[PDB]
Amino acid sequence: MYKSKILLKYIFSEESEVKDLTEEKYNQDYEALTFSFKEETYQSRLAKKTPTKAGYFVTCWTKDENNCNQPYSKEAFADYLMIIVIDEELSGYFLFPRELLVEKGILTTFEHKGKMAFRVYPKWCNQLNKTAGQTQKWQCKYFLNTNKK
Structure with a gap:
């Protein structure tokens, strides 16, 4: 899986059905974006490797009317959250x-x-401790490698 394979897809991509691709204000550190695809709403992030911990850290939060940081509510969130790992x-x-x-x-x-x-x-993550293990089991079923068979 060369890098070039990703950028060829992106250079010869004809068009994206991806509409309203917009950068989100709060989680900008993690390249927060919002967009729709086939009448469905998406929120995406780029997770981060941190030095002392396994897995990849990601933020998902907004500001309420009182300027306090908050998790997103069920009712306000997009249909999907997309976590990119690179x-x-x-x-x-x-x-x-x-x-x-x-x-x-x-x-x-x-x-x-x-x-x-x-x-x-x-x-790809190995040697995870138990909690991280169980977390892994459930995100498992939602993961796709860009280098799939």
């Missing part, structure tokens, strides 16, 4: 539907507050 010779993305985010406590509901940050664990 780690040299390795790239992939998760694509979690809003309802999964709710099931896993990332988005706020009337019942309980969400999370403003989490870790994602691509299929």
Whole structure:
């Protein structure tokens, strides 16, 4: 999986059905974007490798009317959250539907507050500790490697 293969797709791409591609204000550090594809809404981030910890860290948060940082609510969020991972010779993305985010406590509901940050664990990650293991099992089913068979 050369880099060039990604940029050839992007140089000879004819068009994107991707509409309203817009940069988000709050999670800009993680290249936050919003867009629609086939009448569905998306939010994407580029996760980060941190030095002392496994997996890839990502932020998902907004500001309320009182200027306080908050997790996104179930009701306000896009249909999908897309987490891109780029780690040299390795790239992939998760694509979690809003309802999964709710099931896993990332988005706020009337019942309980969400999370403003989490870790994602691509299929390549080995030697994970238990918690990270279990996290990995569930993002597993939503992961795609850019270098798939």
